[PDB]
Symmetry: C2
Subunit: 264 residues, 2 copies
């Protein structure tokens, strides 16, 4: 039944709403009053609509990933998907933290905001971590990357680190990985690096790298980065897309090479 129960948290958190889906039979079963407000769209559209086609295509995968009836907790662990928006374009970042019940899959959707918008993140806490393979592919990214660069974990996980760098700084990475190979585990500071924010705009970071030697193989297993936002961008709307290109595969392949030497 329900409905009051969504009108639960939102008076303390303005940015959230709720949604129940039948899975994987029916779809949109229920939804809070304020999904309309948040998604700027009258619930005349919260029809018997496929919840999945409110998501963006990149996010559908991770969504179905997390919402397996099997691995779900009971109402009484989260992912980020972009949600339209109105039939497109027009998308919004939400944290979805899902659960299981039966109605007469329930998830809390909290909308995500820039670090560069009121409420701003203290510039001294604009920090985020990243982990990447020796082949120079993102193995992991901190949730803090989203409000600071505009990217959900899925956008980077598996993508080439180098592609998210400003080309002028892409040559810098070999030296950096050379010093990582030295020190063999020890972190070193090295400023600055520009990352491309999802809005196309560049944002300068103060960086630190360490990298982890595999205890058995003595080869480097992955590289750690701790970055601090030096300068905020103009366009604080990092979340929304805009709409020498192989320095990348080239330079990646050099680092990977360099990284294959064991260090004892």
């Amino acid at each position: 039944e329900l409905e009051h129960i969504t009108s639960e948290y939102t008076l303390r958190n303005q940015d959230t709403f709720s949604v129940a889906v039948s899975f994987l039979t029916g779809r949109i079963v229920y939804i809070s009053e304020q999904a309309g407000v948040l998604l700027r769209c009258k619930r005349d559209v919260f029809r018997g609509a496929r919840f999945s086609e409110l998501l963006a295509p990149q996010d559908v995968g991770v969504f179905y990933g997390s919402t397996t009836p099997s691995r779900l907790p009971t109402w009484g662990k989260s992912v980020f998907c972009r949600i339209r928006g109105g039939p497109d374009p027009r998308y919004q970042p939400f944290r979805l933290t899902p659960y299981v019940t039966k109605i007469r899959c329930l998830l809390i959707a909290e909308r995500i905001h820039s670090g560069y918008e009121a409420p701003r993140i203290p510039p001294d806490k604009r920090i985020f971590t990243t982990r990447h393979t020796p082949s120079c592919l993102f193995q992991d990214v901190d949730e803090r990357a989203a409000p600071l660069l505009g990217y959900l974990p899925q956008d980077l996980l598996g993508a080439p680190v180098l592609l998210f760098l400003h080309p002028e700084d892409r040559p810098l990475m070999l030296a950096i990985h050379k010093k990582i190979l030295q020190l063999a585990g020890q972190p070193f500071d090295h400023s600055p690096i520009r990352f491309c924010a999802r809005n196309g705009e560049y944002v300068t970071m103060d960086t630190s790298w360490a990298g982890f030697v595999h205890p058995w193989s003595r080869k480097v297993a992955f590289v750690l980065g701790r970055h601090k936002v030096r300068t905020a961008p103009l366009n604080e709307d990092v979340f929304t897309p805009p709409a020498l290109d192989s320095d990348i595969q080239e330079l990646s392949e050099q680092i990977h090479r360099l990284l294959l030497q064991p260090v004892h």
Copy 2:
């Protein structure tokens, strides 16, 4: 026009993939409906079912529901590599029950007289390691990585041929659950020895893992924490396990208390320590 192949061109080309390899078939699915536009001759053979109850099926519906999520994840139109000009997943596929396949998805244009983009999939059956071609005993190893809260953060693909689990089965799940109830309290001690040492490895056989099938397989394990550079705490544990004895049941893929919530939190608490 080269970018777009035909069904006949596909039936031929795949009968070459499934020539130097017998555990593979191909499937193209429409991006519009997820319907199977072309399945290749080997599928019926591998899936022990007629090619009748095929074409027009929503390929997703042939998967196990748990594998469905990792499928849609990697068959994203935008992240897919184009065929013949690449990052796979593992899904169990319904037969006549399920079988394990490595799925390597691609994009391409398929005709059947106007041309339509489709997801093309290379499906290769996964086999036991305790089966011809057996994995040599001294190479029967897999690596694991888990968080200080004791959740699998990563597992090696060797896990599948040795215990029956695809990566999705373990990622995010409780390490201690895949262990024998009796060897669970053992982890405490292991996590102290890790906390005795900033991450140098230490051998400690034996530990028993459940095998999805659901048999116990004794492992010779070793462990090593990764001291987080900037935290000086242990950021995650590493295990390197070798199969001590093979299970009697070679077919580990096919399936048959709350000490678990407790010990984990205990172990996690431990790892809060600054080290030493």
